[PDB]
Write an enzyme that holds these catalytic residues in place. Structure first.
Site, PDB file in Angstrom:
ATOM      1  N   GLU A   1      50.617  45.070  36.510  1.00  0.00           N
ATOM      2  CA  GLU A   1      50.232  46.689  36.347  1.00  0.00           C
ATOM      3  C   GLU A   1      51.129  47.553  35.720  1.00  0.00           C
ATOM      4  OE1 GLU A   1      47.419  47.068  39.652  1.00  0.00           O
ATOM      5  OE2 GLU A   1      45.822  46.046  38.421  1.00  0.00           O
TER       6      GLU A   1
ATOM      7  N   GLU B   1      43.890  37.897  37.971  1.00  0.00           N
ATOM      8  CA  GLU B   1      42.912  38.015  39.623  1.00  0.00           C
ATOM      9  C   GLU B   1      41.788  37.681  39.450  1.00  0.00           C
ATOM     10  OE1 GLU B   1      44.560  41.909  40.700  1.00  0.00           O
ATOM     11  OE2 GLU B   1      46.193  41.575  40.593  1.00  0.00           O
TER      12      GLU B   1
END
Lengths: 989, 989
Positions: free
Chosen positions: A420, A496
């Site tokens: 991210e 994830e």
């Protein structure tokens, strides 16, 4: 008029965009026969609030101590009284203006004295395996250099600076630096020298770095071995010997081993190895395995694999980033014991010792660089270091140190650029570097969905629906044709998924079914392995975990840090028990007639030879029969039908119809493994002969009428309210409809989609489901049998200021011994609030009993909880637990403890036992009300009031994963409807 | 199988749609010479949770008492321990399913014994002036009847039931009934017999009802008198005599009085009157006034009037609905003392005694029926009683009782159908009835904007902008042409405006300017007169007011009940002081050169003869000159220029330039009135000779440099932070920029308009203005005078996780005695958050001083607070107050106490005095921080920490009325900008 501000020099350094200075080249972590002294232990420590007040009083020399106190190294110093931990998810805890740092910047001065024997001369170095976030190092008063990259190793040459005899190592560590901007992981902010400090001798004619290349040719069975060795960056003469394969070869030459046993997470074969120079020898463990992407499938050793993964953060309740080795080994065993085979090191490299354990126990490891700039997203990614040219050398360095350290370990099957951090030039540079240095491991990175500079298409928290489209190769195209063709040829991984916060995660089965059936789908890594709870005690001595905001944070994100499959002490949550079943590597389907079971080997390489196949038939009175059956080994991705002994099926037919009986077939370890004892359960399946519906008792008892009370057999009623005041002996204080539960963590997350994005919890509050009231409409007797009669009680349930409601009719009956209860629910007006349809948590009944329950037993699914979209690991059988063990110790209290699929139940209130039977219902028993549950923020807030709150549910809602990712799936939602359900009650003794 | 539920009969009654049964015809409240015994005093009282458990044990007979305790009647029994009060705004506190009532329904049985002498035989009645909500009455065991309409009178004939000697009156009161659905006013739910209970003899040949008709012919000056009198509903012979006008006439005949002095709120002339029959005489007060709507203007006695109004609820901190007479008189005086001339009885008829006081003191009264169904709105008005035919007789009855009771009082100039009850047939029936019975009073009702069945167009909380369009007659048309033509011919009234919750209300001046200039605009009634705070004590003995939720409510609306111009004990709020000035009936404009002042008579009927016109010139050293000037009476709506004595203007020119001096001209009562003493101030105006800007001191002192500290004259600096640590003697703990204040009640209301409807408070929290941090950029000296030098300190202020900010430069200077401070603010990035522009509360400085302030003095606007869109009542002058009196005791603590327009200030810290001067700035001094202010929910939460929090502001935002109605107006908003401002500091002694 010059400048007068203090500490400008230190701050200029902290705000530097350059990688550290003065360090030796980045290289691999190596087991070496060279002398070595670990400096770990009790160091001295001084804390200053900021650079401008940090004393410049020659403290590096270690004499005339002023203000220093003892501190153990390695450590995260806020875990030891100095300051406090602080947790933010996305947001930075300081003003976003890179590269600048706030005035409130804890500065920790560290100092230790040690003895250097002659074995560390002439040449030696000092090694720091981790300093968060900015180190400056002095030895005997001379600066060695600085460190950047909090989870990366650094080495400093001490030749001509180290002196025989004692030496004084001094290290100044600043919490915040320019590097903080690129270390914004969702976790606690914890500065300190949190990993090993070591003095290592560097003899002449030694070996600085080694790069193992161990490929496997799955056609011929050959191993492809080349072991590079270097010194000062140049290749050197060295012999590498592997005794088991009878090989002696020179470093730098590739040979073909006639036959090798390949390495996998399932079979982690390792060959002991040494590469030797005249002055130094380093010991190695070589795992032969080749990684390849073929036909849009991620393959190892020629076979598509399935990643059964978790995201592993490094955390300890009392020690922060410092995870003791015995805890590492324990939790890695615990993972294996729950069928896990893959680990993503979210989102920084782990302790150097981690990699060998992974090689040994068997995990497919995604090894992730220390990089995340997630707090820039809220500003449109403005000023993102990932695309700022001034940050290129700092980020390339991070990747280099990451790759170089761990490049020798067979367990690492993917290099990941970070997490991210958006999209930009520096991320492309990090990829280009890695592809050049190590072509043997494909590259991962989620931040760039175009996947322009990676080898696998990765996403986080994509819905089951989108995953299914991707699985079929029919997802929407990128606008660039060239990039689209590339991406569609890539396999897909969820780095994830199924966010495991609080009650949940729901929807795991639907993801797993897609992983089977669609080769392109690599699998997924659950977010996450562990809760980051920090232990905190009170005067009386009880322990509870602290979460964002419990440590005086000005800026924090609450309990999001507690979102794991285990708690900070590695105690399982129900999610882990369910996850184990979902990813079970063997599938067992027991035949209805109990003549045998279908066995499907879900493994990728191993057969079934490591497993013992055992069966048992259990009845209410205990086990009836049991044994073990022989199973010819089943190949990977193959299946056969195993017969059971004829005595089993003969016993099935012999059961009098209506009697309950459970056949369980278990796949267990025939022998001890390195990660569990013989007798460990891996997979299982069941076939249940259900007990028939319970007969409604004959309504032969009449309702005797008094002024304020009504009696119908063993149940006494309040003639005013119309509800029971006792059943048998046990008092009843309240009986009512339920439609609500204390919101889970998922219930608090936003319902993305539609014009309604209020969290389900907020939708409930606005609609008033938490604050229901009931109005009596009438009470009436009616003719039953042989003079007896039923009692019907009509009510309407609603909320204040609301017009919508449900009509609730209770018709009671009894034959003197067992009570018959029928409940009918009817919708009144339209269930809409603020323009959106109201959904229900449940359709059930609350029994508030006037006495405590010591023990709860039931026939159904257990032992642990189960909700419609969970409970995969709850199996059929007979269960019994004390009241405390019915509950679940989530850090923020919330709805939990329901046992779905219950056929019968028994509560033990003193010397009396309350039996409940009927069609499948959910069971929950608590010593406190729902309101105190929903009000509580930590476990200590839960107080037993002296009552029993019993919940019987004819329907439940799912729990989903709305805290992050998909909410409850359509099939598990609970919209308002009409409903009817029967129960039978009894009090014995 | 019959029904077995209890109390079904009582509940059937409570759920009845019919008006009460058994009552005598509704009639006027009359002062009669007939015998009368008030039954008020200590009665006996029993409370039951609901009808189903309310005993039916013959308690009406008043013997063998079981469970009864003493209770004073009249009362609101929750104010006396039984149960607790409960406040909701819109929402009902029970499930909305009319006509049904909840099981939890407090039932209060009331009982008293009294002696009936022979003067009350043969005929008598019992009168109940108010029972909330459902009464059932027994006398000596026989049922008289029931009551509906909680604020309406009921009378029951006791002939043949009353017995000579003692008698036992028994009354069962239920809190909730079908009538609750139509009594959903925003206020506390308070059941009980809350108004007078009376036994009245009804002699033969008496007078039951009387209807006064007293018109005025403003051309001729004639009065038009007809006094109707009746008995048993039939007109009867009776003589009516008015001694002052020398009239004796028979009832039922209209006569023309040659000359009468008309009645008005300004001149409430009343003529004492009696109407006599052989058996009874009733005394009256007649006010001659005619009401008419002409040319879209609401006119009295031929002249358009201006309504200066408030909404008057009946409330008492300790007694609930029971308002003692001395409190009524006091608050009505207090209204007059603040220039108020009109009252809306929101939203039910008041105590019967109210009407005579209004006639006497002088108010234009809007008399409002007891009707409101506002909690049905959230469901689209489904099931609204206002349009349900079954509710017609109950609502017509409510209006009839309302009109009949008060129809004789000149102060009532409008009948209102109710409040916020939607639109429907029953509201049209109530209007038709009223128009038929009393054509002399126009009809009001806001709920139907089409205005189809009213005589004035009314609205609540319409913006200044829409009010201005309406004033010009150019508002949007109704779709029906016929209705539009009608409505455009109606005058316009704001029945509720400038919501007075918390700090505020803002924007009153802009409404008032529209009321002048536009005849069509009738004026407005502020919401509202009083806060509904309920007193509540603690162990230590301190008192604070309770608001929604402080009494264990399950459903409530917080502090909205505290939204008044005075607190529950009638102590003024600043809003009232400002409101007084805004509606001042005279305008005084002092000439700049002080030769005289323009006087405009804003009154509608009276001249200026009741006023004494006085002037004073004040200087720093006290009053310089004063006197009173003679003013020929000025006619209504006329103006003249009054000269002042030449000594005044001569004194103006004699002032040395730069010296401050204030000329104040005041319009005061020349003589005592019935509502204030002689010397009461009504209007005022001012002309100020400002003090010139303060000279910046010469920078002749140098900055001496040390290791950790810098000194520049009397101010010591921290060389690390760059901020002062002391000035003179007084220590400084912190100095920083401010951009935020603890949200007001208005700040918590939603910003209707645009895609951003977050309350301003929420916009701030998201943007981080409450959590600002400052980073030091540099400290620098620079050349000044004669060797001296300035000190410049550069900072940047922002918030965590945010990129936008302001650069703040402090340049310091001193000549040894006074300190010179310059502040420069520069915008850095774009101030946007979540897609919307961030606004600021303020641009200022926080001084946190290390010592307490005993007293605060200033030259500017005062004595009370003032914000940009308030402070109309703050006048120029010199003020001095203890620290406690600088604060404002709002029930929920919030931003308050700022004194805008300050030129100089002096804080007294022990034996030292801190002077602050400079261009106009706002002053605020508190003994606690902003964070503890914003955190506090009640006054006791405010703790003095031992410090002084000083706030100097170069700009402030408005406060508006966003809690309900317009937010801050454009001209008073504060968007992010650049700014510069100078201050001078000094410490003496």
């Amino acid at each position: 008029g010059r400048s007068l501000e203090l500490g400008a020099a230190d701050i200029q350094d902290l705000e530097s965009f350059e990688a550290g200075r003065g360090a030796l080249p980045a290289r691999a972590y190596l087991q070496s026969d060279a002398p070595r002294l670990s400096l770990n232990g009790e160091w001295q420590f001084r804390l200053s609030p900021g650079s401008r007040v940090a004393p410049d009083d020659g403290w590096q020399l270690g004499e005339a101590l002023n203000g220093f106190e003892s501190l153990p190294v390695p450590s995260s110093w806020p875990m030891h009284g100095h300051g406090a931990p602080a947790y933010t998810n996305v947001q930075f805890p300081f003003a976003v203006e890179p590269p600048h740092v706030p005035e409130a910047n804890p500065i920790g001065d560290h100092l230790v004295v040690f003895e250097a024997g002659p074995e560390f001369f002439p040449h030696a170095l000092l090694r720091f395996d981790g300093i968060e976030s900015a180190g400056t190092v002095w030895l005997n008063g001379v600066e060695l250099g600085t460190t950047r990259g909090s989870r990366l190793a650094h080495e400093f040459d001490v030749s001509g600076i180290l002196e025989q005899g004692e030496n004084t190592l001094a290290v100044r560590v600043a919490q915040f630096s320019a590097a903080s901007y690129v270390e914004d992981q969702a976790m606690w902010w914890l500065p300190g020298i949190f990993r090993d400090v070591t003095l290592q001798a560097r003899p002449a004619a030694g070996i600085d770095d080694v790069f193992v290349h161990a490929g496997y040719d799955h056609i011929t069975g050959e191993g492809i071995l080349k072991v590079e060795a270097s010194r000062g960056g140049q290749a050197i003469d060295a012999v590498v010997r592997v005794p088991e394969l009878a090989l002696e070869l020179a470093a730098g030459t590739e040979v073909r081993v006639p036959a090798v046993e390949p390495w996998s997470a399932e079979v982690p074969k390792l060959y002991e190895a040494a590469v030797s120079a005249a002055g130094e020898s380093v010991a190695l463990q070589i795992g032969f395995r080749s990684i390849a992407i073929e036909d849009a499938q991620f393959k190892v050793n020629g076979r598509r694999i399935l990643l059964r993964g978790v995201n592993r953060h490094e955390h300890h309740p009392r020690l922060g980033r410092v995870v003791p080795r015995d805890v590492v080994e324990a939790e890695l065993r615990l993972m294996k014991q729950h069928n896990i085979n893959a680990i993503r090191t979210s989102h920084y490299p782990p302790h150097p010792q981690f990699l060998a354990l992974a090689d040994q126990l068997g995990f497919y490891v995604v090894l992730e660089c220390d990089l995340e700039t997630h707090g820039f997203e809220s500003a449109g990614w403005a000023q993102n270091p990932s695309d700022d040219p001034q940050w290129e050398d700092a980020l390339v360095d991070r990747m280099r140190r990451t790759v170089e350290r761990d490049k020798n370990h067979a367990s690492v099957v993917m290099w990941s650029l970070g997490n991210e951090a958006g999209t930009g030039r520096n991320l492309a540079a990090m990829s280009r570097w890695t592809k050049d240095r190590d072509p043997s491991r494909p590259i991962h990175y989620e931040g760039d969905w175009s996947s322009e500079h990676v080898d696998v298409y990765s996403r986080m928290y994509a819905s089951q629906a989108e995953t299914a489209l991707i699985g079929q190769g029919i997802e929407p195209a990128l606008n660039d044709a060239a990039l689209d063709a590339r991406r569609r040829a890539m396999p897909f991984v969820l780095c994830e998924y199924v966010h495991a916060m609080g009650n949940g995660p729901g929807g795991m089965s639907e993801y797993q079914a897609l992983f089977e059936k669609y080769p392109r789908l690599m699998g997924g890594f659950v977010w996450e392995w562990l809760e980051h709870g920090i232990t905190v005690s009170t005067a009386d001595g009880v322990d509870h975990y602290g979460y964002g905001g419990d440590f005086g944070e000005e800026v924090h994100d609450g309990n999001f840090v507690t979102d794991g499959l285990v708690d900070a002490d590695r105690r399982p949550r129900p999610g882990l028990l369910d996850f184990k079943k979902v990813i079970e590597p063997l599938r067992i389907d027991v035949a209805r007639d109990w003549t045998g079971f279908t066995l499907r080997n879900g493994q990728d390489f191993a057969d079934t030879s490591a497993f013992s196949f055992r069966y048992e038939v259990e009845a209410d009175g205990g086990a009836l029969d049991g044994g073990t059956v022989d199973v010819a080994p089943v190949a990977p991705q193959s299946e056969t039908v195993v017969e059971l002994p004829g005595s089993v099926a003969a016993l099935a037919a012999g059961l009098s119809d209506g009697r309950p009986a459970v056949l369980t077939v278990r796949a267990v370890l025939g022998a001890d493994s390195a990660w569990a004892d013989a007798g460990h359960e891996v997979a299982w399946g069941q076939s249940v002969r259900e007990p028939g519906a319970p007969v409604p008792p004959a309504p032969v008892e009449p309702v005797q009428v008094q002024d304020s009370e009504l009696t119908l057999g063993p149940v006494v009623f309040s003639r005013a309210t119309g509800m029971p005041t006792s059943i048998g002996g046990v008092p009843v204080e309240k009986l009512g409809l339920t439609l609500w539960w204390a919101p889970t963590d998922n219930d608090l997350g936003r319902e993305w989609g539609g014009a309604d994005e209020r969290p389900l919890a907020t939708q409930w509050k606005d609609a008033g489901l938490n604050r229901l009231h009931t109005r009596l409409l009438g009470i009436s007797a009616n003719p039953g049998q042989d003079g007896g009669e039923t009692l019907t009680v009509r009510t309407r349930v609603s909320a204040a200021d609301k017009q919508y409601g449900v009509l609730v009719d209770y018709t009671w009956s009894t034959d003197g011994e067992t009570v018959g209860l029928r409940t009918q629910v009817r919708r009144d007006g339209t269930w809409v609030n603020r323009g959106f349809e109201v959904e229900w948590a449940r359709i059930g009944l609350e029994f508030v009993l006037g006495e405590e329950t010591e023990l709860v037993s039931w026939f159904g699914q257990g032992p642990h909880q189960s909700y419609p979209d969970t409970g995969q690991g709850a199996r059929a059988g007979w269960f019994s637990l004390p009241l405390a063990k019915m509950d679940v110790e989530y850090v923020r209290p919330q709805e939990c403890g329901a046992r779905s699929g219950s056929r019968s139940a028994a509560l033990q209130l003193g010397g009396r036992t309350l039996e409940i039977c009927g069609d499948p219902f959910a069971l929950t028993v608590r010593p406190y009300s729902q309101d105190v549950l929903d009000a509580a923020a930590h476990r200590p807030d839960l107080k037993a009031d002296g009552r029993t709150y019993l919940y019987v549910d004819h329907a439940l809602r799912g729990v989903g994963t709305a805290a992050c990712g998909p909410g409850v799936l359509e099939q598990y939602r609970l919209k308002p409807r009409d409903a009817d359900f029967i129960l039978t009650l009894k009090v014995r003794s």
